[PDB]
Every structure is written in C-alpha cells, then in structure tokens.
C-alpha cells in the first residue's frame, strides 16, 4: 500500500526524538526539553526530560501523556489504521484538554513532525485554575505510572482522530488523582491520510531518575501498541 508505506518507512528504524515544552500553570512559568529515540517496529521509546528553568512546579508524572503516538507499534492486520504515521513528515498538530478532578487544567497544543531525521513534538501547555495546595501544585503524586489503554476514534471532520481516556495517578495515602483527557489530531499537511476505525492503544510508562543528573528530570521508558480490531 504505496500511501500507507510513505509514513511507515519513515519508522522502520531508530529514530532521534526531540521534545520541546513550553508552560505556564498558574502563572509558574517552566520550560522542558527532551531527547530519545523511538523504535516503532517494537513500540518502544526512550527518553529523558529536563527541566531547564529550575524546579518543575508540577509533578511529573502529569506531563507523560503531554510529552508521540507516530512511535506506536501498529501489528501488519491494523496498518491501514495508523493515522499517526500515514500523517508523516509533514505531521499532525495534537491538541489536548486535561482535567485534573477536583482541580485544574492543563491545555495543550503540539506539533509532531520530522525536521530531517529527527521527530520534534513542540508543544505549548497552559494550566489554569489550579489549587496552590492541590495535588498538583503541591506536588503530592507518587513518582510512578499506571498502563493504561486509550481509544483511538476517527474524527472525519477534521480530517484526523479524536482520543479520550482517563489517566490514574497514584497518591502517597492510597487515594488516586484523576486527570481526564480530551484529545485531537489533525494532519500539518493537505495530503491524503488514514482514518482509522475504532482501535485502542495500550500503554505502559516507567518513570525514574539518572543519578548523575542534578537538574530536576525525569526518564521515561515506554512501549505502546495497537489493538482493539482483531
């Protein structure tokens, strides 16, 4: 399928990762800058986030889902349903709204897309409403990650697809923050791109730390693959 194999072939190996994050939550102004490599044939990425205005005023683990679904393994049965890659290079805008319960939000609006040989997600996030002394402000999540699924719908009227699912994290008494998230992407180029079907991806996410590194940060090692049409 000469349409679907374009984006595919941009994947067929390791490729670099750059992430670029610029926030305001609650008027705590932050920057973020990542590196990796992704392996989409095996689903899998790895990378490492910085903080490079000091303390990251959020939690980390609330900027997982924010901080490259391209990177996806999508089994040969379900290629004709990979928006993601069918999008490449010139790539998709993913915009979000996250709704933390009973506290802020976070907006989001990225632009995933190759520049050469490197794939850039340059995002912009602004969270409002937060509570000082919230979970989230007041740094109050467990430095884990929970898998979870998320359900991939095709949203043809902005020629692209449309997520929602509901992120768990942990708390340090038992208890569980929820952060509920409202998703769309939509292709950077006019070219022709798949719309997939209902299908889900399944996630799993594991956070830690790099001992030499005395800048607040985060380390990320996941695996995401499609399913949901057997």
């Known amino acids: 399928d000469p349409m679907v194999s374009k984006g595919e072939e941009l994947f067929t190996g390791v490729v670099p990762i750059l992430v670029e994050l610029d926030g305001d939550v609650n008027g705590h102004k932050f920057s973020v800058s990542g590196e990796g490599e992704g392996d989409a044939t095996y689903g899998k990425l790895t990378l490492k986030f910085i903080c490079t205005t000091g303390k990251l005023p959020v939690p980390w683990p609330t900027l997982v889902t924010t901080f490259l ?49 490197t794939l850039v997600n340059r995002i912009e996030l602004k969270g409002i409403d937060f509570k000082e002394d919230g979970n989230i402000l007041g740094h109050k999540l467990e430095y884990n990650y929970n898998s979870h699924n998320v359900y991939i719908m095709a949203d043809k009227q902005k020629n692209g697809i449309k997520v929602n699912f509901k992120i768990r994290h942990n708390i340090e008494d038992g208890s569980v923050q929820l952060a509920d998230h409202y998703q769309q992407n939509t292709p950077i180029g006019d070219g022709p791109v798949l719309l997939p079907d209902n299908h889900y991806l399944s996630y799993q996410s594991a956070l830690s730390k790099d001992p030499n590194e005395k800048r607040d940060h985060m380390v990320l090692l996941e695996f995401v693959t499609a399913a949901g049409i057997t």
Do not use: L, W
Not at 69 to 96: I, L, N, T, W
């Open 69 to 117: 679904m391209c990177f996806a393994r999508y089994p040969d049965h379900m290629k004709q349903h990979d928006f993601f890659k069918s999008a490449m290079p010139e790539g998709y805008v993913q915009e979000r709204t996250i709704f933390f319960k009973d506290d802020g939000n976070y907006k989001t609006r990225a632009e995933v897309k190759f520049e050469g040989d």
